[PDB]
Write a structure and sequence with these properties.
part of a larger assembly; 4 chains; A: alpha/beta; two-stranded antiparallel ribbon; 12 strands; 18% strand; B: mainly alpha; rod-shaped; binds guanosine-5'-diphosphate; structural protein; doublet microtubule; tubulin; flagella
């Protein structure tokens, strides 16, 4: 009874969210009509974490979908599992997104902010207890970046104690899907730093690199890319849903990994990802997972950990396995590569073990790490932002909506200070 | 036997700081060798630099000089980025080697003493046994002499 | 009276260098006698 | 558990390696697809030295194949043995070899170097113990001479303790396959002297001579010529893989035969070799083996020992045999020809015996020796190098890649001092 409320914003959020429930429903055993047809008692133990039960054996997820134009919402419902959601949790506007942050935050956001909070209110106050919320959004856009952050402020004010875990997709360095991302991402970080507890950064190019390198997918589509992200969101909350030899939920993760209030941006990775031909050469051992997680190529964010130093690291293991074998790997991987870890924090690797694995695999693992290498990704957007700022670039579109020019200067200054803050703790 | 300690000391003192002077000798030389130079092996350019100056050759040779100016501008720019890197790598490697060499000298010192503490332990063992026996026998005779005296006094 | 252990002594970056990239092949002629 | 990792570089290395993996796979009774179809339990005692096991009963060699152009690699794939190797261990470029030492070392070698080293890291840190590495390459070419030496330096930097045994093919003196060879051979030897613990030198001319004299082959192809080389490579490591009366692995061989760190270039020879029709009439015994081994005509390198003197010699015997009979020959062959051994080292002949012979042969012997007759080999190439270097024009192919003419002077001087060093221990 540690309920979690799930919120999806924009084109990125709904499509990642739609695939997310396909993963969980098969894991728990819910038919797409919403009924239980499982095979084990352990699945019905703690389905209350994510679901409500309508009288009749029909289970409804705690999902709220947010958008400014209903275009992507209707593409979701035609999908197989679209019928599952409650129809009244679909909250949408009737105006274009504009791919504009100020437009999302000020013009259309305020109109939607009134109604969206009450939909959050119904789901937040229908349960015996509430551990935190769960946000899925992208930062390069105008709907996910703009309206997603506005709801983040309201949630913090109303529910300060609760954990506001957010999952974000960061604009890519080589080819990126929006011209005005440097404005959008710079402002969005200003809201994310001060309000959110936990933030995970995903880069689309790394998803492409993993698919071509490891899985040997000749044509990876956004279904496959969103499939990889779902495992990480599935993996983190598995400690809530199933028994384990050493439990570690969200709040344990934040306390151990976060040394200071502003340094909480994280990178993730998932193992085992098996090549469609290399399997017959791969014997699944507990050491075999450990090599993949800490391998730099497996990281889901295109910032190289080797270029920085680690502050904290965490590994989650799933299945029935030896507790000695897991604990040994943490000591060996830490001692073998001491050059990438901070001296004034010994035992930098946190561990946990959960009993029930994903279907088809008898063992799997998940990794979450925190490192100074995030200085790379902030400097990229800062360098791009200043150039568009030095001459007045697209700015006139944001100013017309009502955003003051001083908001950018506050945004860049706070973003700049977080670059220095990572630098200072490296020593 | 007390004289044997002096011969122990002179052998130890002469040998101990014979090593110490030699231990400084190799550290004295290698620590202050040329660091302000990149030797020939470190000056090799990237293959991308080869095409730019190969294509710049033909631009000059074809009498297309306006475009040749642009590539010369990019060629010098691409050198400065690459020149700085190999300076860093050489300095990083040069700093490591003296650290790597220095740590080896002190390990031999640690093993140097182990040959000398145990040699003194054997010397101390033979030191104690003989004098104890000499005192053991003489004290008994001194006791024995008083034992015969006790019949009268 | 007794032997004594003698303590031995223990013996325990600027990028301003002079090198530059090598000599390239150059297209300009070097025969002014038959050219000038 | 003395694992050995195998690396093949260039056209010459792959063809030698491809034939080499047939020989051991037969010896252990291993099917080309990777399954044990063998005949005795003793073959599975210590198979771990060369093969990794993939769950499914398949054995995978600890091999990495390296090339600059993909032409040689596809010959391995299309060949009979194209499935056995792990796919990820094929690393190749997309540029011509160039048949050039400088271009391979600096221009293309750098790009492939980091990609190569991580593949070795997968193999090197996959086993409980690791005795050394094994490289096969030619010195006259461009990839094996250029990139082969570059990898040998990096491996020394990362694994100083391990034994870097190399098998090298030296350019032939009369008729040779490449014109620029004196430049390629000279520069490679400078790198090999300071890097590798052990170097075995093999010349193609002796193999033509040995097959044409002894085996009575009218038309020797490279298939049979490489077969003689592979016997030497298997014979050296036979002590690791099988029990015996008196064991002697690589590090025993290096300790005994190498009196000073720089004098470690070796010649090899193998016995018995007998005509395919004459083998019935031959009474092959222990004394018969020694006659072939020390005979100058069975030397795989074209350096007549009678013009120099022996410093150290080693003999390996395989098969069930008398220890008394082996020991007597080492006395007699050392005493009968005292003009060919150095006086200031008594007992110059090392011996060893192994239990299990190769297939078809009841008994066999292998010879490894170090002698001052090597001065013959280096005198030929230095004179040809001096003859060509007198007209610096061919250097222009090497200058356009970045190599400075001083590096020619450095390489030749270091080779010259090695020759003088051999001369002065002869007295
Ligand atoms: N992984 C993933 N990324 C997506 C998907 N759809 C869009 N994106 C990325 O999300 C970023 C911004 O999307 P956007 O259309 O602005 O979403 P919005 O917040 O609703 O405006 C773009 O850079 C896209 O590359 C998807 O299905 N999967
Ligand atoms: N003994 C033997 N020598 C070979 C074989 N293949 C190539 N060589 C020799 O390798 C030398 C040059 O090899 P090369 O094609 O340049 O390979 P590279 O090092 O990759 O450039 C020639 O002298 C060949 O005689 C082989 O299968 N056996």
């Amino acid at each position: 009874v540690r309920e979690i409320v799930h919120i999806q914003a924009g084109q990125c959020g709904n499509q990642i969210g739609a695939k997310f429930w396909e993963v969980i429903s098969d894991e728990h055993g819910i038919d797409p009509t919403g009924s239980y047809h499982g095979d084990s008692d352990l699945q019905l133990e703690r389905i209350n974490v994510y679901y409500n039960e309508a009288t009749g054996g029909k289970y409804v997820p705690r999902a709220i979908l947010v958008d400014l134009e209903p275009g992507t919402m209707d593409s979701v419902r035609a999908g197989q599992f679209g019928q599952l959601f409650r129809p009244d949790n679909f909250v949408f506007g009737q105006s274009g997104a504009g791919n504009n942050w100020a437009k999302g935050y000020y013009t259309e956001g305020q109109e939607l902010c009134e109604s969206i909070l009450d939909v959050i209110r119904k789901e937040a106050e229908s349960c015996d207890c509430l551990q935190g919320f769960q946000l899925v959004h992208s930062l390069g856009g105008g709907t996910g970046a703009g309206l997603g952050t506005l709801l983040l402020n309201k949630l913090r004010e109303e529910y300060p104690d609760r954990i506001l875990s957010t999952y974000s997709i960061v604009p890519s360095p080589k080819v990126s899907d929006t011209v005005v991302e440097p404005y959008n991402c710079t402002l969005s970080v200003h809201q994310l730093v001060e309000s959110a507890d936990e933030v995970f950064c995903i880069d689309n190019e790394a998803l492409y690199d993993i698919c071509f390198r490891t899985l040997k997918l000749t044509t990876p589509t956004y279904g496959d890319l969103n499939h990889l992200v779902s495992m990480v969101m599935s993996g983190t909350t598995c400690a809530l849903r199933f028994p384990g030899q050493l439990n570690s939920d969200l709040r344990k993760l934040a306390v151990n990994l976060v040394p200071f209030p502003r340094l909480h941006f994280f990178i993730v990775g998932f193992a085992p990802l098996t090549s469609r031909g290399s399997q017959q050469y791969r014997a699944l051992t507990v050491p075999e997972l450990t090599s993949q997680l800490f391998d730099n190529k497996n990281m889901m964010a295109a910032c190289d950990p080797r270029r920085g130093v680690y502050l904290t690291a965490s590994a989650h293991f799933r299945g029935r396995m030896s507790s000695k074998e897991v604990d040994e790997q943490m000591l060996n991987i830490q001692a073998r590569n001491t050059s990438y870890f901070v001296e004034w924090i010994p035992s930098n690797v946190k561990s946990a073990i959960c009993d029930i694995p994903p279907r088809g695999l008898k063992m799997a693992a998940t990794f979450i790490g925190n490192t100074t290498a995030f200085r790379e990704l902030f400097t990229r957007v800062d360098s791009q932002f200043q150039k568009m700022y030095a001459r007045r670039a697209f700015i006139h579109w944001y100013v017309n909506e009502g955003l003051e020019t001083v908001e950018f200067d506050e945004a860049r200054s706070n973003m700049t200070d977080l670059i220095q803050e990572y630098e200072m703790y490296e020593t | 036997w007390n004289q044997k300690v002096t011969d122990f000391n002179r052998t130890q003192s002469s040998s101990a700081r014979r090593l110490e002077r030699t231990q400084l000798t190799r550290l004295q030389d290698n620590d202050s060798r040329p660091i302000d130079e990149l030797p020939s092996s470190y000056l090799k350019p990237s293959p991308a630099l080869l095409d730019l100056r190969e294509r710049e050759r033909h631009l000059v040779l074809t009498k297309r000089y306006d475009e040749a100016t642009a590539l010369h501008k990019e060629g010098n720019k691409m050198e400065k980025i690459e020149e700085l890197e190999k300076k860093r790598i050489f300095l990083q490697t040069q700093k490591r080697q003296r650290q790597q060499l220095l740590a080896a000298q002190d390990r031999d010192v640690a093993g140097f003493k182990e040959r000398w503490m145990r040699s003194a332990d054997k010397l101390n063992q033979t030191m104690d046994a003989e004098v104890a026996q000499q005192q053991k026998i003489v004290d008994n005779i001194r006791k024995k002499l008083e034992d015969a005296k006790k019949e009268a006094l | 009276l007794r032997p004594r252990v003698e303590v031995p002594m223990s013996t325990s970056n600027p990028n301003t260098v002079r090198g530059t990239f090598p000599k390239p092949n150059r297209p300009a002629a070097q025969n002014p006698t038959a050219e000038y």
